[PDB]
C-alpha cells in the first residue's frame, strides 16, 4: 500500500528484518493478479 512506486530502470528496494512476516495477508488476499515462488511452496512461507 505504497502510494507511488519506482521505475524499473531504478527499481526501489526496502529491506525487511527483525520482524514477523504474515504471508496470509499476501497469499489469501485475492486483490493481486499473480504470485509465484521459485525455491519454496507458497503455503510453506509461514513455516520458514
Amino acid at each position: 500500500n505504497a502510494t507511488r512506486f519506482a521505475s524499473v530502470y531504478a527499481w526501489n528496494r526496502k529491506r525487511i528484518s527483525n520482524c514477523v512476516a504474515d504471508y496470509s495477508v499476501l497469499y489469501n488476499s485475492a486483490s493481486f493478479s499473480t504470485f509465484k515462488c521459485y525455491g519454496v511452496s507458497p503455503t510453506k512461507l509461514n513455516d520458514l
Binding site: 497469499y27 489469501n28 485475492a30 507458497p42 503455503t43
Partner: protein, 49 residues
C-alpha cells in the same frame, strides 16, 4: 530419449505436482479434480490459486 521423445514435445507424459496429503506406499491416484491451495473453495474447472 530416442524411443518416445518428439521435437515439439511428447506431451502424453504427465506427472502430479499437487496432492492433499502424501500417498501411502504403492498407492495409485488417477484423480483429475482441481486442487485448492488457498483458503478459498474452488468448485469449477479453474480459479484463483
Amino acid at each position: 530419449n530416442n524411443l518416445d521423445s518428439k521435437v515439439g514435445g511428447n506431451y502424453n507424459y504427465l506427472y502430479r505436482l499437487f496432492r492433499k496429503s502424501n500417498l501411502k506406499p504403492f498407492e495409485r491416484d488417477i484423480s483429475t479434480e482441481i486442487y485448492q491451495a488457498g483458503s478459498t473453495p474452488c468448485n469449477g474447472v479453474e480459479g484463483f490459486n
